[PDB]
Amino acid sequence: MKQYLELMQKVLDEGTQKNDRTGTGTLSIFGHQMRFNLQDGFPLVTTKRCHLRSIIHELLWFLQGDTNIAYLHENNVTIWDEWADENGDLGPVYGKQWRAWPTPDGRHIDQITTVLNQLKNDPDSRRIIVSAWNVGELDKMALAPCHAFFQFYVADGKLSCQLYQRSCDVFLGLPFNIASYALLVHMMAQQCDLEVGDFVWTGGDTHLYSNHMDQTHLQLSREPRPLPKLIIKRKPESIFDYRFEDFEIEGYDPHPGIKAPVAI
Amino acid sequence: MKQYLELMQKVLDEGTQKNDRTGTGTLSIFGHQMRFNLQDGFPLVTTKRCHLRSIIHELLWFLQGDTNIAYLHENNVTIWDEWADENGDLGPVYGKQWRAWPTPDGRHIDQITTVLNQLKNDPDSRRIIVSAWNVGELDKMALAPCHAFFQFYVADGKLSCQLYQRSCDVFLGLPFNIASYALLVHMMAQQCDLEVGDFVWTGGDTHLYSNHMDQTHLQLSREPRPLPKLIIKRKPESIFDYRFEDFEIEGYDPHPGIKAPVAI
Numbered sequence: 288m289k290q291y292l293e294l295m296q297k298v299l300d301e302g303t304q305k306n307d308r309t310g311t312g313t314l315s316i317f318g319h320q321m322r323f324n325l326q327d328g329f330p331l332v333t334t335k336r337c338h339l340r341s342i343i344h345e346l347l348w349f350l351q352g353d354t355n356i357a358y359l360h361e362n363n364v365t366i367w368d369e370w371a372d373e374n375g376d377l378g379p380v381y382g383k384q385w386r387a388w389p390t391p392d393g394r395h396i397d398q399i400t401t402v403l404n405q406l407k408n409d410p411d412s413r414r415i416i417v418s419a420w421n422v423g424e425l426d427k428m429a430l431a432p433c434h435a436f437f438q439f440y441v442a443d444g445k446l447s448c449q450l451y452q453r454s455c456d457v458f459l460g461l462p463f464n465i466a467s468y469a470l471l472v473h474m475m476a477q478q479c480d481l482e483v484g485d486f487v488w489t490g491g492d493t494h495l496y497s498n499h500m501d502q503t504h505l506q507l508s509r510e511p512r513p514l515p516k517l518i519i520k521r522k523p524e525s526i527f528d529y530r531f532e533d534f535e536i537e538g539y540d541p542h543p544g545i546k547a548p549v550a551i
Numbered sequence: 552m553k554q555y556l557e558l559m560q561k562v563l564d565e566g567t568q569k570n571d572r573t574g575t576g577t578l579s580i581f582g583h584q585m586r587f588n589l590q591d592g593f594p595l596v597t598t599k600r601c602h603l604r605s606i607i608h609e610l611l612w613f614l615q616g617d618t619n620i621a622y623l624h625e626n627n628v629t630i631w632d633e634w635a636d637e638n639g640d641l642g643p644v645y646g647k648q649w650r651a652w653p654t655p656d657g658r659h660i661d662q663i664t665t666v667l668n669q670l671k672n673d674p675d676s677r678r679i680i681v682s683a684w685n686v687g688e689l690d691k692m693a694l695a696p697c698h699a700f701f702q703f704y705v706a707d708g709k710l711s712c713q714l715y716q717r718s719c720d721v722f723l724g725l726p727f728n729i730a731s732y733a734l735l736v737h738m739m740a741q742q743c744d745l746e747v748g749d750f751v752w753t754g755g756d757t758h759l760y761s762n763h764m765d766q767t768h769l770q771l772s773r774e775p776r777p778l779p780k781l782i783i784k785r786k787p788e789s790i791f792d793y794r795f796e797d798f799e800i801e802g803y804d805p806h807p808g809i810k811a812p813v814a815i
C-alpha cells in the first residue's frame with residue numbers, strides 16, 4: 288500500500304541505527320501516524336502476499352479471551368509458537384485483558400462488551416477505549432503488548448478507530464496489525480449498524496530489523512495493486528460469534544510472498 | 552505556536568459538529584499528531600498568556616502521587632476545583648496511577664521509578680511506558696484521564712516522549728498539556744543525563760467547544776512570538792524533589808490572555 292511503502296522508505300531514510308532486546312539491530316524512528324479510509328478498500332498489503340488465515344484466526348482468538356496457542360494450532364496458525372511456554376501459554380496477554388481485565392478488588396472487566404454498550408448507548412463518548420497495557424500483569428506476560436491501546440470514535444454514522452502501537456516491526460508485524468484492526472472495525476460497525484470510517488495507526492518505536500534489508504529493498508521495487516474488498520457473509524448474534532468462514536476478501540491479487548526471519 | 556495554530560485552523564476547517572458529555576457541543580476531528588523539537592525552545596503558547604504557576608504545580612502534584620486538590624489550593628491553583636468532591640478528592644486519577652498502580656494481588660507499582668530504572672539501565676527498551684488508564688479503577692475517577700498513555704524513547708543521546716491524549720480541548724487544555732509534558736521531559740532528561748529530544752503529541756477526539764469560537768478567531772489573528780527557554784536552576788536528588796522555584800522560563804512575552812469558560 289502507498290502509505291505502507293512510504294513508511295518503509297521513511298525508516299530507511301531517517302531511521303537511526305539502534306540496538307534492541309533481540310540483539311538483532313534496527314533502523315528506527317519514533318512517532319508516526321497514517322490513516323486508512325476503510326471505504327477505499329480493505330488495507331491488506333499487496334506488494335507481498337499476506338497469510339489471511341493467520342490474521343483472521345488471531346483476531347477471533349483474541350476475542351475468545353484465549354491466551355493459550357492451542358486454538359491456533361488446531362487451525363494451523365503457528366505465529367505465536369516461539370513465545371509460548373511448555374503448556375502453550377503466553378500469560379495474560381491481549382485476549383485476557385480484552386475480555387477479563389482483573390481489578391484490584393477481585394472483579395473482571397470485559398472491555399469489548401463495555402465498548403459495545405458505549406457504541407450503542409453513547410456514541411459521542413470520548414472514552415470508548417480498550418487497553419491491553421495492564422501494568423499490574425506485565426511481568427506475567429510472555430511479550431509486552433505491541434498494539435496496546437485503541438479508541439473508537441463515531442461521527443456522521445461512521446465508526447473510526449485509532450490504534451497506538453508502542454513498538455512496530457514494519458516488515459513482519461505491521462501488515463498483520465493493520466489488517467487485523469481494520470477487520471475488527473468492520474465487525475464492530477456491523478454489530479452496531481454503522482458505516483466504516485477511518486483506521487488511524489499511530490506508532491511509537493517504528494523499525495526495520497537489520498536482517499530485513501534485502502526483503503525491504505525487494506518489496507519497495509514493487510507497485511501496489513488495487514486494494515481488495517472485505518465481504519462479511521453473515522451477521523452473527525454477537526461480536527463473539529464470528530467464524531473464519533464468514534469472511535471473504537474479494538480481488539486480492541498480491542505480489543509473491545517474501546520470507547523473513549522473526550526476531551525472538 | 553505554528554503547530555498549535557494550524558491545528559486550531561484544521562479543526563475549524565474539518566471539524567464535524569458533534570454533541571458531547573457536557574452538552575456544550577463541539578467541532579471535532581479524530582486523529583492528529585504534531586511534534587515539537589525541544590531543542591528549538593520551550594513549547595509554551597505565545598498567542599495567549601498561559602498561567603505557568605498552574606501548569607508547573609499540577610505536574611509536581613502528579614509526581615507526588617497526590618489526587619486531593621489541597622496541595623493545589625495551598626499554592627493558589629484552582630484548575631481542578633469543579634471536579635473534586637466535598638473532601639477535595641478526585642479519585643485515583645493521574646497521580647495515583649503514576650505512583651501507585653494497584654495490582655490484583657495487593658501490590659502497588661511506581662511507574663515513574665520503573666521508568667527511571669529503564670532509562671538508566673536499558674535505554675533501548677521499547678517498553679518505557681507510563682499509563683494512567685487503569686480500567687479497574689475508572690469508575691472511581693472523577694474524570695477519565697485525558698492524557699492517558701505516554702512512552703519515552705532514547706536515540707543519539709536524546710530523550711523523546713510521545714503522549715496519547717484520548718480527548719483534547721484544543722483551546723483550554725492543549726496549551727497546558729503540551730507545556731506540562733515538555734517540562735516532564737526536561738526533568739527526566741536532567742535526571743538521566745540526556746539531551747532533550749522531541750515531544751510527539753498524538754490526539755484522539757481533538758475538538759473546539761462551541762462556546763470558544765470568538766476566542767479561537769481572536770487568537771488565530773495573532774502572530775506567534777519566539778518560543779521561550781526553560782532553565783532548570785538546580786538538579787535535585789530525584790525526579791520527586793523538584794520545587795516551583797527551580798524553574799525559569801526566559802523570554803516569555805505572550806499576547807494578552809483570553810478568558811474562556813470550562814465545560815464541566
Ligand SMILES: C#CCN(Cc1ccc2[nH]c(N)nc(=O)c2c1)c1ccc(C(=O)N[C@@H](CCC(=O)O)C(=O)O)cc1
Nearest residue numbers: 338341365366367456459460461463464546549550551
Ligand atoms: C503482528 C503479529 C502477530 N505475530 C506475533 C508477533 C510476535 C512477536 C514478534 N516479534 C518480532 N520481532 N516481530 C513481530 O512482528 C512479531 C509478531 C506474528 C508473528 C509471526 C509472523 C510471521 O512470521 N509471519 C509470516 C507468515 C508465516 C506463517 O504463515 O506462519 C509472514 O511472512 O508474514 C507474523 C505475525
Ligand SMILES: C#CCN(Cc1ccc2[nH]c(N)nc(=O)c2c1)c1ccc(C(=O)N[C@@H](CCC(=O)O)C(=O)O)cc1
Nearest residue numbers: 602605629630631720723724725727728810813814815
Ligand atoms: C489541561 C489541563 C488541566 N486542567 C484540568 C481539566 C479538567 C477538565 C477539563 N474539561 C474541559 N472541558 N476542558 C479542559 O481543558 C479541562 C481541563 C485545566 C483546567 C482548567 C483550566 C483553565 O481554566 N485555565 C485557565 C486559567 C485559569 C486559572 O489561572 O486558574 C486558562 O485560561 O487557561 C486549565 C487546565
Ligand SMILES: *c1cc(=O)[nH]c(=O)n1[C@H]1C[C@H](O)[C@@H](COP(=O)(O)O)O1
Nearest residue numbers: 308431433434454455456460461677
Ligand atoms: C509485537 C507483536 C505485534 O502485534 N506487532 C509487532 O510489530 N510486534 C513487534 C514489535 C517488536 O519488533 C517485537 C516485540 O519486541 P519489543 O517488546 O518491542 O522489544 O515484535
Ligand SMILES: *c1cc(=O)[nH]c(=O)n1[C@H]1C[C@H](O)[C@@H](COP(=O)(O)O)O1
Nearest residue numbers: 413572695697698718719720724725
Ligand atoms: C481533560 C483534562 C486534560 O488534561 N486535558 C484536556 O484537554 N481535557 C479535556 C478533554 C475534554 O474536553 C474534557 C474531558 O471530557 P471527556 O472525558 O473527554 O468527555 O476535558
